[PDB]
Design a protein around this ligand. Structure first.
Ligand SMILES: [Mg+2]
Length: 792
RNA sequence: UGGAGUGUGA
């Protein structure tokens, strides 16, 4: 069947007005038609095909096209308002390479279907009409800019400037039409991406290396880095007077020119000298940025909400959609004002802390609170602990003092940290991590009469490198320990807030919890606390662009303690490259008969063992989907859940509520009045816990926008929750309030988070599991670690 | 790796 229809509109919270970045578009009625494109020989170059089509149009616009102006998608589809006076005619295009183009009328799209879908009278989205409108709107943007997909950004509009290590950053908008509740919306939003500067090869190499290589040949690592950076760069020769030929470069010779600047190897297309070549403008940097040039872009793309709103308004008026021939002929009419969306600021929930404290309750003012005069619900009275000093700057006395300070902070925050460790702290070196870990574990087990450790405070260096991952992998797949790796800078500079955050982390890293909603304690949460429910969360973390070697990791967590649900236990796996499903939610093989598996079954069994009873309802929070596979993901990951529940106990099919969360979109909400105190306590974003479900949401399906976090800088992007499946029959107010309330139960922070802790923990587990691989099956987690939040 | 929050809808 189709998705879950929207049951209604929310009412809770104080009314307020925000401004979205969606611009109303009025659909035309011109009987738009699509004409197929066939070019022989076949070339997969979108720019070349577009140029060929443009030349064909210029040649034969008044010949047999009837003065009708086509709109070409770029690869295979051509759209024209009305109907051309011909059906199947072929035109020859000579660029002098010659091409043969075949054009045939395919079918006629229906704008009335788009109107019916936007009016809420059906549930099927006319992808054809939406794509035709998008392409006819973006023809002029493609012509005037450099397309990178749905974003057309070019220089001389924001003065692109230096980024770091050669490549720079460009600025511009992101345009994508979308069918919303109020009608078609042009989702214009500012965007930026990295570009390679048109610099000579010598200058670019010097900037990337940050030094001079006039007389120093490159090392193996330097050569590998140069090849990785330069793989896929177009360069043009400049030594010739009037030969503007281009030579794509992917391989570099291993020998110098003599075997000018002939010492260094010359690029191979013969052997093109690297001293008389220039990088072609417009190239895009692949892979991912480094830690130094990511922040340089962050200082560019991170601007105030008012500045971003003004930039979007300026960009929309700069395109002038009311003047371009494509939209004038096609009947398009785009507005130039931000939608005045009404919102609702949901109230913050009451948090209950331990009775043994001055403050037994807390009301988060602006989405963040403090632990002063409060104690955790559950201390864990850690008794056995040890420390490893993987650093040389810090001394034994300094490390012992840091441990004592952390313990005192834990005790005053509500723990019972042991004053003295099992074994005296000793300093090792960051290369013998395995030997140090086995030595510490074996010594601790030899002492304390064969009782395992409960914690391991590790002071690893600032830029350790290949050390944190190895340490965590060994401790969580070969030893079975719990570690609290810290950095040397914070050990040297002790701050009470840092100690409190570390205490909050190590409380939940050893069982128990530190804060609970009063509604959860009082068994008063709508449609949750009435009967036991297990709240799941999934996330699939794909590797860095082209990384076939490394597989993709999927993680699934689930709440484990009922009456005050805060404790999530998760499992991880490794599946095929760039796979958008989770093949390990259920697995059946032959073993004498057919023993089952998967993560759903294991987590349900763990929940049953932990709380004494099987869960009665399920609330699934999926993440990491790309909007192109909702149907497939829902079908597979709901059939897997049903089969896992059936296999565990017969006739056990609890209701499920499949909700997909994703923050990767370009829907921004701005404060209606920037001169008023209705925004965050800073000079920035809108108030936390504000819900939007009108005028920018799906016309018929069930979704909402929730900005539950207090943005610290830049324009905070609210999360998007889409309820694909709903068997509990959640009301709009109930689901919005529940999702907002969970955001206040994050273990590691004393603030409200943007996405739900289920999905956030699933993402953290998936990101952490990348350190375990060293083949399709990941190493098995130890049995003393899977029951505790090792990832937090 | 104290933490939340800021850049890509494959
Ligand atoms: Mg994720």
């Amino acid at each position: 069947s189709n998705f879950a229809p929207r049951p209604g509109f929310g009412t809770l919270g104080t009314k307020c007005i925000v401004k979205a970045n969606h611009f109303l578009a009025d659909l035309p009625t011109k009987d738009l038609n699509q004409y197929d494109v066939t070019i022989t020989p076949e070339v997969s170059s979108k720019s070349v095909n577009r140029a060929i089509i443009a030349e064909l149009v210029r040649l034969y616009k008044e010949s047999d096209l009837g003065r009708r102006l086509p709109a070409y998608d770029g690869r295979k589809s051509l759209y024209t308002a009305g109907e051309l006076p011909f059906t199947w005619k072929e035109f020859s295009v000579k660029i002098e390479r010659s091409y043969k183009v075949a054009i045939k009328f395919v079918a006629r799209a229906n704008m009335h279907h788009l109107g019916e879908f936007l009016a809420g009278k059906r549930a099927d989205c006319p992808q054809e009409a939406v794509q035709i409108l998008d392409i006819v709107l973006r023809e002029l943007s493609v012509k005037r800019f450099c397309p990178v997909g749905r974003s057309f950004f070019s220089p001389d509009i924001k003065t692109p400037q230096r980024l770091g290590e050669g490549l720079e950053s460009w600025c511009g908008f992101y345009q994508s039409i979308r069918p919303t509740q109020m009608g078609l919306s042009l989702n214009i939003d500012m965007a930026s991406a990295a570009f390679i500067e048109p610099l000579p090869v010598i200058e670019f190499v010097a900037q990337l290396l940050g030094k001079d290589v006039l007389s120093k040949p490159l090392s193996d690592s330097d050569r590998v880095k140069i090849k990785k950076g330069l793989r896929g760069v177009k360069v043009e020769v400049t030594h010739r007077a009037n030969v503007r030929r281009k030579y794509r470069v992917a391989g570099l010779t291993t020998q110098p020119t003599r075997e000018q600047h002939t010492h260094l190897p010359c690029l191979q297309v013969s052997y093109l000298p690297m001293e008389a070549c220039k990088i072609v403008e417009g190239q895009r940097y692949t892979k991912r940025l480094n830690e130094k040039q990511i922040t340089a872009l962050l200082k560019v793309t991170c601007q105030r909400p008012r500045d971003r709103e003004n930039d979007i308004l300026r960009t929309v008026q700069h395109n002038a959609y009311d003047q371009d021939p494509y939209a004038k002929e096609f009947g398009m009419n785009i507005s130039e004002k931000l939608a005045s969306v009404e919102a609702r600021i949901l109230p913050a929930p009451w948090l209950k802390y331990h009775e043994n404290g001055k403050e037994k309750d807390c009301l988060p003012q602006v989405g963040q609170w403090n632990m002063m005069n409060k104690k955790m619900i559950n201390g864990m009275t850690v008794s056995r602990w040890a420390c490893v000093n993987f650093s040389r700057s810090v001394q034994e006395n300094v490390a012992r003092g840091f441990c004592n300070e952390l313990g005192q902070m834990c005790e005053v925050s509500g723990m019972e940290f042991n004053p003295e460790p099992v074994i005296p702290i000793y300093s090792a070196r960051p290369d013998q991590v395995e030997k140090a870990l086995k030595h510490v574990y074996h010594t601790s087990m030899n002492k304390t009469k064969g009782k395992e450790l409960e914690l391991l405070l590790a002071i690893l260096p600032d830029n350790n490198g290949s050390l944190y991952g190895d340490l965590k992998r060994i401790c969580e797949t070969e030893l079975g320990l719990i570690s609290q790796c810290c950095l040397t800078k914070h050990v040297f500079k002790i701050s009470k807030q840092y100690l409190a955050n570390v205490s909050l982390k190590i409380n939940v890293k050893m069982g128990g919890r530190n804060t609970v909603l009063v509604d959860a304690i009082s068994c008063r949460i709508p449609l949750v606390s009435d009967i036991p429910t297990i709240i799941f969360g999934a996330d699939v973390t794909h590797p860095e662009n082209g990384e076939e070697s490394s597989p993709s990791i999927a993680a699934v967590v689930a709440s484990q303690d009922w009456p005050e649900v805060t404790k999530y236990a998760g499992l991880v796996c490794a599946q095929a490259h760039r796979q958008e499903l989770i093949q390990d939610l259920y697995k059946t093989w032959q073993d004498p008969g057919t023993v089952s598996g998967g993560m759903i079954r294991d987590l349900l069994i763990s929940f049953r063992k932990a709380t004494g009873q099987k869960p009665l309802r399920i609330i699934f929070y999926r993440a990491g989907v790309s909007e192109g596979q909702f149907y497939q993901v829902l079908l597979y990951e709901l059939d897997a859940i049903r089969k896992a529940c059936a296999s565990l106990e017969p006739n056990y099919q609890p209701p499920v509520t499949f909700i997909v969360v994703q923050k990767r979109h370009h829907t921004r909400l701005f404060a209606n009045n920037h001169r008023d105190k209705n925004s965050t306590d800073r000079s920035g974003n809108i108030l936390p816990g504000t819900v939007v479900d009108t005028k920018i949401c799906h016309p018929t399906e069930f979704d909402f926008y929730l900005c539950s976090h207090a943005g610290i800088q830049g324009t905070s992007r609210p999360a998007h929750y889409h309820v694909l499946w709903d068997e509990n029959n959640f009301t709009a107010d109930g689901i919005q309030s529940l999702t907002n309330n969970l955001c206040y139960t994050y273990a590691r922070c004393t603030r409200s988070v943007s996405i739900v802790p289920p999905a956030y923990y699933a993402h953290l587990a998936a990101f952490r599991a990348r350190f375990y691989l060293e083949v399709k099956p990941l190493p098995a987690l130890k049995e003393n670690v899977k029951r505790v939040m090792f990832y937090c």
